């Protein structure tokens, strides 16, 4: 019933920009909290972002506060996040994450900064 | 696509039975099996509905 | 502790005044189930089994009987006839 | 067993009173069978049901 | 019609039994009259109600 479909990744260099997507099925995004996670190669899975269920307040981890912009699209049922000022530390597989009854994991998309 | 091509060069015929999750009614599935019946025995039965 | 190996710390053979813990304003939630917190100073128990764990901000709703969620259904389940208090406060300045 | 039709009246009223009193060791769908453990740490708009 | 004084007893007993059969299909103000729909769609400790 619930599936998260990641896209929008790619290969950029240092100082690049990108626009990811997380296509979602089975739930409106107005009712639950969504999150973004990433997993670098050789590193464990780390949290990236969140938008709350009211749609007002967003958060980020300490490496990614202020540089990225996460947004929701309500009619599309897809949650994006904007990449700007891409350091090579952001080389990871990016997973969008949601708690709708059971918490569910997408297969992710690849962003390489080099 | 020549007849003296190899199995890597000759076409593997691909069909994609796509699956998505959108607000649409279910139309095409796979089949449903059904076992044999015995008679003169207290058994639970499940007919079509 | 984290909640896959959440710590049960049972307390025994002492006197606890829950009016001080009731009147502390550093806590946010005071949801309780058995018999009144204004008479928690008035009764007399046999065993405590106090807990200590750290969760998200959204799993405050999960600390109730028969909830949904992978903590509630898979990791840390409360009984349907759960009897006791939960006390909680935000720890953004600690964790 | 000569006086059974006098005995069964007293035995039935004793079994009725025994059945009447034994109803008060039952939970009746609440959490407890004693009043305060049902009511009072629970919120009084939702314990009166 | 001479034998109505025996027929009314059997008719009243079948009437009483066939009344009590018809409250098997009574919702009584719940969500569902079938307990399978009770267990299937809605959550266990509020299926208590």
Swiss-Prot record, chain B:
Effect annotated for changing residue 2 to R: In strain: Omicron/BA.1, Omicron/BA.2, Omicron/BA.2.12.1, Omicron/BA.2.75, Omicron/BA.4, Omicron/BA.5, Omicron/BQ.1.1, Omicron/XBB.1.5, Omicron/EG.5.1
Consequence when changing residue 5 to Y: In strain: Alpha/B.1.1.7, Beta/B.1.351, Gamma/P.1, Theta/P.3, Mu/B.1.621, 19B/501Y, Omicron/BA.1, Omicron/BA.2, Omicron/BA.2.12.1, Omicron/BA.2.75, Omicron/BA.4, Omicron/BA.5, Omicron/BQ.1.1, Omicron/XBB.1.5, Omicron/EG.5.1; May enhance affinity to human ACE2 receptor
Outcome, altering residue 23 to P: Increased resistance to human covalescent sera neutralization
Disordered as annotated region, ranges: 23-45
Quaternary structure and interacting proteins, as annotated: Binds to host ACE2. RBD also interacts with the N-linked glycan on 'Asn-90' of ACE2. Cleavage of S generates a polybasic C-terminal sequence on S1 that binds to host Neuropilin-1 (NRP1) and Neuropilin-2 (NRP2) receptors. Interacts with host integrin alpha-5/beta-1 (ITGA5:ITGB1) and with ACE2 in complex with integrin alpha-5/beta-1 (ITGA5:ITGB1). May interact via cytoplasmic c-terminus with M protein. May interact (via N-terminus) with host bilirubin and biliverdin, thereby preventing antibody binding to the SARS-CoV-2 spike NTD via an allosteric mechanism.
Function summary: Attaches the virion to the cell membrane by interacting with host receptor, initiating the infection. The major receptor is host ACE2. When S2/S2' has been cleaved, binding to the receptor triggers direct fusion at the cell membrane. When S2/S2' has not been cleaved, binding to the receptor results in internalization of the virus by endocytosis using host TFRC and GRM2 and leading to fusion of the virion membrane with the host endosomal membrane. Alternatively, may use NRP1/NRP2 and integrin as entry receptors.
UniProt protein name: Spike protein S1
Organism expressing this protein natively: Severe acute respiratory syndrome coronavirus 2 (2019-nCoV)
Gene it is expressed from: S
From Swiss-Prot, chain C:
Superkingdom per UniProt: Viruses
Outcome following mutation: residue 93 to K: In strain: Omicron/BA.1, Omicron/BA.2, Omicron/BA.2.12.1, Omicron/BA.2.75, Omicron/BA.4, Omicron/BA.5, Omicron/BQ.1.1, Omicron/XBB.1.5, Omicron/EG.5.1
Consequence recorded when altering residue 26 to P: In strain: Omicron/BA.1, Omicron/BA.2, Omicron/BA.2.12.1, Omicron/BA.2.75, Omicron/BA.4, Omicron/BA.5, Omicron/BQ.1.1, Omicron/XBB.1.5, Omicron/EG.5.1
Disulfide bonds: 32-85
Effect after changing residue 61 to S: In strain: Omicron/BA.2, Omicron/BA.2.12.1, Omicron/BA.2.75, Omicron/BA.4, Omicron/BA.5, Omicron/BQ.1.1, Omicron/XBB.1.5, Omicron/EG.5.1
UniProt region (Integrin-binding motif), positions on chain: 56-58
Effect on the protein of changing residue 24 to L: In strain: Omicron/BA.1
Role: Attaches the virion to the cell membrane by interacting with host receptor, initiating the infection. The major receptor is host ACE2. When S2/S2' has been cleaved, binding to the receptor triggers direct fusion at the cell membrane. When S2/S2' has not been cleaved, binding to the receptor results in internalization of the virus by endocytosis using host TFRC and GRM2 and leading to fusion of the virion membrane with the host endosomal membrane. Alternatively, may use NRP1/NRP2 and integrin as entry receptors.
Complex and partners: Binds to host ACE2. RBD also interacts with the N-linked glycan on 'Asn-90' of ACE2. Cleavage of S generates a polybasic C-terminal sequence on S1 that binds to host Neuropilin-1 (NRP1) and Neuropilin-2 (NRP2) receptors. Interacts with host integrin alpha-5/beta-1 (ITGA5:ITGB1) and with ACE2 in complex with integrin alpha-5/beta-1 (ITGA5:ITGB1). May interact via cytoplasmic c-terminus with M protein. May interact (via N-terminus) with host bilirubin and biliverdin, thereby preventing antibody binding to the SARS-CoV-2 spike NTD via an allosteric mechanism.
Protein name from the UniProt record: Spike protein S1
Source species of the chain: Severe acute respiratory syndrome coronavirus 2
Gene: S
Residue span relative to the full protein: 348 to 442 of 1273
UniProtKB/Swiss-Prot annotation, chains D, E:
Effect recorded for residue 8 to N: In strain: Delta/B.1.617.2, Mu/B.1.621
UniProt-reported outcome of changing residue 40 to A: In strain: Alpha/B.1.1.7
Entry coiled-coil feature ranges: 7-49
Known role: Subunit of the fusion protein that is processed upon entry into the host cell. Mediates fusion of the virion and cellular membranes by functioning as a class I viral fusion protein. Contains a viral fusion peptide that is unmasked after S2 cleavage. This cleavage can occur at the cell membrane by host TMPRSS2 or during endocytosis by host CSTL. In either case, this triggers an extensive and irreversible conformational change that leads to fusion of the viral envelope with the cellular cytoplasmic membrane, releasing viral genomic RNA into the host cell cytoplasm.
Protein name (Swiss-Prot/TrEMBL): Spike protein S2'
Residues of the full protein shown: 943 to 991 of 1273
């Amino acid at each position: 019933q619930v599936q998260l479909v990641e896209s929008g990744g790619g290969l950029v260099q240092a100082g690049g920009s990108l626009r990811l997507s997380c296509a979602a099925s089975g739930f409106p995004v107005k009712n639950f909290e969504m999150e973004w996670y990433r997993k670098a190669p050789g590193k464990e899975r780390e949290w990236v972002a969140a938008i709350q269920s009211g749609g007002v307040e967003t958060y980020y981890a300490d490496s990614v506060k202020g540089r990225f912009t996460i947004s929701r699209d309500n009619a599309k049922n897809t949650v994006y996040l904007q990449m700007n000022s891409l350091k090579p530390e952001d080389t990871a597989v990016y997973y969008c994450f949601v708690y709708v009854g059971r918490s569910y994991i997408g297969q992710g998309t690849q962003v390489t900064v080099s | 696509f020549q007849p003296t091509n190899g199995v890597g060069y000759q076409p593997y015929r691909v069909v994609v039975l796509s699956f998505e999750l959108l607000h649409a009614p279910a139309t095409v599935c796979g089949p449903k099996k059904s076992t044999n019946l015995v008679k003169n025995k207290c058994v639970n039965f499940n007919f079509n509905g | 502790a984290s909640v896959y190996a959440w710590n049960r710390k049972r307390i025994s053979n002492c006197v606890a005044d829950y009016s001080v813990l009731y009147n502390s304003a550093s806590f946010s939630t005071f949801k309780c189930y058995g018999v009144s917190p204004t008479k928690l100073n008035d009764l007399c128990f046999t065993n405590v089994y106090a807990d200590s764990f750290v969760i998200r901000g959204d799993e405050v709703r999960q600390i109730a009987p028969g909830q949904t969620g992978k903590i509630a259904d898979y990791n840390y389940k409360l009984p349907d006839d759960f009897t006791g208090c939960v006390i909680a406060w935000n720890s953004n300045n600690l964790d | 067993s000569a006086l059974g039709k006098l005995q069964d009246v007293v035995n039935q009223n004793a079994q009725a009173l025994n059945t009447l009193v034994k109803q008060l060791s039952s939970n009746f769908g609440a959490i407890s069978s004693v009043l305060n453990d049902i009511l009072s740490r629970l919120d009084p708009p939702e314990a009166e049901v």
